[PDB]
Design a binder for these strands. Structure first.
Ligand SMILES: Nc1ncnc2c1ncn2[C@@H]1O[C@H](CSCC[C@H](N)C(=O)O)[C@@H](O)[C@H]1O
Ligand SMILES: [Zn+2]
Ligand SMILES: [Zn+2]
Length: 834
DNA sequence: GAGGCCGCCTGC
DNA sequence: GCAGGCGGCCTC
């Protein structure tokens, strides 16, 4: 009711006199106290905030600054959240004291000084541990920022964080050269923490500028002819026009300019920073020259051509800084330079767009002259053959002692690639129990890891139940494989590592209305871990495959919570849907490159083009490459050292019938079972594959052009399935027309890869009749080999697999692609520094 | 055995 | 509307 200032006003401003205390209804209030408020726009019952400032206005009104908390129910957590728990957020605002509903108790819960070694009345008392970022779903440690002489009156973490953020992202001119008739020339500018100078290079969107070389529009493909429905009875199911793994809609990688001039104008006597122009020399990517794509197949993805072509461009369009060097200017070798840091390109020649020839670069294209990092001791659970820890190893952040893998062939393979790790094949529940019970070793004399040994913990838990392909996920098997993530969390609790990584399939975020996700995040929060989740697309990290994977990252209290890696390669946009919705809110990762990227998309050609031809059933585990690496990608995976022998280029031996089918799948992109002819085929011995027979009306699909029926079963007519309607050994598989109408016509089954395209998600057993079925070679009539699958996953050719062909396929299919793991690992490395 | 057969699927 | 996709289960 009545509000009155208690005490002497501190630091009186011009329009404000700030106070540290006030009285409302006999109750005493002070800065740092917390308070309740009732919202007007609320579907949410209550608001809670800290009082940062108490000033009175010259308008006579009496004000305070509110730094809002967030209730765990308003975070990704939701109803799983602890009801007493609040999080700090970047919401704050000025408000009239009249609005305070009450004074509430809010306590800060710090991670214990012993935190690492743990994990074995009052109408209500609120608490907070972590600061929440609503946009990225990041739970991070509170800022350490402290108030001082001038701050103590208005000090607000939200305000500060906002001021720093918009200060850092706003464009500013650093150095000025000369003013002429209103135009200012600048030597130095900055935005978003990056400093740009004359002579630096810059990433622009593909649309920023064009090249003197122009691309040709010409004639689109006219219908080659009407199809013959008698011969090709299932072709009509192709009306969609969508080609799985097509690269046609893939964006171009960034344009790259070299900065020659920088200018802007003036506004109100001062330089207008909001508008800054850059004048650039354009670089050509090889595919931008007349050579186009088919002339660039063999070039380094980071090689450019210098040109004197210029363009003017807006600063605001700059996507970031990159390094471009003249090869001969290099103190080190080109490989060493390319491998030494991100955003690194080079050029040897220059491109004349007029003459279409390559020249030594002009003198002005030349540059002037014209800490041992300790590896985290890592424990890899559900290690598989080791893809994930292989990626971490390439990133130099981890040395993996202790892998746990239950499936023997995978553990063997891990061992073969990891001479220095103790690999336990036990059930992880059992092992955890053993170490919990005080055991130093296991029956085999393998030393168990103990609290303090494990710095980093990582793994993919079984994805079989979480997979959207799994019809039976509701049964006992899939559920059993589901409790394992809780087991993994138990490891995290017990060992309390500095860094935590959990990987799974994308569907892991949507499963059981996102309950799994919510519960594991809640778990990590209870433990006191900084954490976050996100979905990454492997393709954006340099393999030619669509693999969308859920990644959950946690960091111990003392650490810095890593960020998800920014995409390196462009990739087809439909295959890029990375957002997740939980409880009606949309969440995205910290990732800012939504359209383009620094490197061109890695292709199927780039992946397997060097592999010797083989037939269905090839069993030769060691055969010579006959040839050199044909691509950048192949060069990266084959190494530079003499290595004449190609391993695992074997492929499954498919039945005579399946092999005839494969033989009749056309080579063209988007080819699959729907292109099969309906014809009789002589199989092995006296076995004959008879035509498929259509004896039922399909009430949905109607009659063919010829007038034939389209049904293979009575269910086509809305009647119940009749067994004995089932036809055997037909070229066109009976079951596909059977259920096609509710399966999207089983697109991709017996499908081919295309050279210019990418692989569909590489699974544990390539099967042309499997739900993910375009496993055919772009050319040869056979399923992809183990080597080819390994390549699709970005494994080095030297990585060893163990067991029979199905075993190796499964080890490959299960793995986190090393390039993805490498990217994530580099983010972690970023945290290890500072 | 590994291949024929497949969800009142999910998700934007 | 239609495209995704470390699949499981039952047996030629
Ligand atoms: N109960 C259990 N205890 C320990 N390991 C198990 C297990 N159940 C399944 N596994 C194993 O966990 C493995 C996960 S495969 C994951 C591979 C890894 N992420 C990589 O990059 O290579 C499977 O191969 C499976 O055999
Ligand atoms: Zn504020
Ligand atoms: Zn039927």
């Amino acid at each position: 009711d009545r509000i009155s200032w208690l005490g002497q006003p501190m630091k009186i401003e011009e329009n404000r006199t700030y106070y540290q205390k006030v009285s409302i209804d006999e109750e005493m209030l002070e800065v740092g106290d917390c308070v309740s408020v009732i919202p007007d726009d609320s579907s949410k019952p209550l608001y809670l905030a800290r009082v940062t400032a108490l000033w009175e206005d010259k308008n006579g009104q009496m004000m305070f600054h509110a730094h809002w908390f967030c209730a765990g129910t308003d975070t990704v957590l939701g109803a799983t959240s602890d009801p007493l728990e609040l999080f700090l957020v970047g919401e704050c605002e000025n408000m009239q004291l009249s609005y305070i509903h009450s004074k509430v108790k809010v306590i800060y819960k710090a991670p214990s000084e012993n935190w690492a070694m743990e994990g074995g009345e009052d109408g209500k008392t609120y608490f907070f541990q972590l600061w929440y970022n609503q946009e990225y779903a990041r739970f991070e440690s509170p800022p350490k920022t402290q108030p001082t002489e001038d701050n103590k009156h208005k000090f607000c973490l939200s305000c500060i964080r906002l001021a720093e953020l918009r200060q850092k992202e706003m464009p500013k001119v650093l150095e000025q050269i000369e003013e002429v008739d209103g135009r200012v020339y600048c030597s130095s500018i900055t935005k978003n923490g990056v400093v740009y100078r004359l002579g630096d290079s810059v990433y622009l969107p593909p649309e920023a500028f064009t090249f003197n070389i122009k691309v040709a529009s010409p004639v689109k493909r006219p219908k080659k002819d009407p199809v013959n429905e008698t011969l090709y009875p299932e072709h009509y199911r192709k009306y969609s026009d969508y080609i799985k793994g097509s690269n046609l809609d893939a964006p171009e990688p960034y344009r790259i300019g070299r900065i020659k001039e920088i200018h802007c104008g003036k506004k109100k006597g001062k330089v207008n920073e909001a508008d800054i122009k850059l004048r650039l020399y354009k670089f050509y990517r090889p595919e931008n020259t007349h050579r186009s794509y088919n002339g660039s197949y063999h070039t380094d993805i980071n090689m450019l051509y210098w040109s004197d072509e210029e363009a003017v461009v807006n600063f605001s369009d700059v996507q970031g800084r990159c390094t471009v060097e003249y090869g001969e200017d290099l103190l080190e070798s080109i490989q060493d330079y390319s491998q030494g840091g991100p955003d690194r390109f080079y050029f040897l020649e220059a491109y004349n767009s007029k003459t279409k020839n390559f020249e030594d670069p002009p003198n002005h294209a030349r540059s002037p002259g014209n800490i041992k990092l300790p590896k985290l001791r890592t424990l890899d659970v559900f290690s598989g053959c080791g893809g994930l820890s292989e990626g971490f190893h390439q990133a130099g952040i981890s040395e993996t002692l202790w892998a746990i893998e239950m499936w023997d062939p995978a553990a063997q393979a891990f061992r073969l690639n990891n001479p220095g790790t103790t690999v336990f094949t036990e059930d992880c529940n059992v092992l955890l129990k053993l170490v919990m019970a005080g055991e130093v070793t296991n029956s085999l004399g393998q030393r168990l890891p103990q609290k303090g040994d494990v710095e980093m913990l990582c793994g993919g838990p079984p994805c079989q139940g979480f997979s959207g392909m799994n019809r039976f996920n509701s049964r006992t098997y899939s559920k059993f494989k589901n409790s394992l993530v809780v087991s993994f969390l138990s490891y995290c609790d017990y060992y309390r590592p500095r860094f935590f990584l959990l990987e799974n399939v994308r569907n892991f975020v949507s499963y059981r209305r996102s309950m799994v996700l919510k519960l594991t995040l809640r778990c990590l929060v209870r433990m006191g871990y900084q954490c976050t989740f996100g979905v990454l697309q492997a393709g954006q990290y340099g393999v030619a495959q669509t693999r969308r994977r859920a990644i959950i990252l946690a960091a111990a209290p003392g650490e810095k919570l890593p960020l998800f890696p920014e995409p390196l390669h462009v990739f087809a946009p439909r295959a890029c849907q990375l957002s997740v919705v939980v409880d009606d809110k949309k969440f995205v990762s910290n990732i800012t490159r939504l359209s383009s990227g620094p490197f061109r998309t890695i292709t199927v050609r780039d992946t397997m083009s060097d592999l010797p031809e083989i037939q269905n059933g090839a069993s030769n585990s060691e055969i010579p490459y006959n040839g050199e690496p044909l691509s950048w990608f192949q060069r990266q995976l084959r190494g530079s050292h003499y290595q004449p022998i190609l391993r695992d280029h074997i492929c499954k031996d498919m039945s005579p019938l399946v092999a005839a089918r494969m033989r009749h799948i056309p080579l063209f992109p988007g080819s699959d079972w729907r292109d099969l002819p309906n014809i009789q085929v002589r199989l092995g011995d006296g076995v004959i594959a008879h035509k498929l027979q259509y004896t039922f009306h399909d009430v949905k699909n109607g009659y063919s052009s010829t007038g034939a029926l389209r049904g293979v079963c009575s269910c086509a007519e809305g009647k119940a399935c009749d067994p004995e309607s089932r036809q055997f050994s037909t070229l066109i598989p009976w079951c596909l027309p059977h259920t096609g109408n509710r399966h999207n016509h089983w697109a991709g089954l017996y499908g081919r890869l295309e050279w210019d395209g990418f692989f569909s998600t590489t699974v544990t057993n390539p099967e042309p009749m499997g739900k993910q079925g375009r496993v055919l070679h772009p050319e040869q009539h056979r399923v992809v080999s183990v080597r080819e699958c390994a390549r699709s996953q970005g494994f080095p050719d030297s990585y060893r697999f163990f067991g029979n062909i199905l075993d190796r396929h499964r080890q490959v299919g299960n793995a986190v692609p090393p390039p993805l793991a490498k990217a994530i690992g580099l983010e972690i490395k970023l945290c290890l520094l500072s």
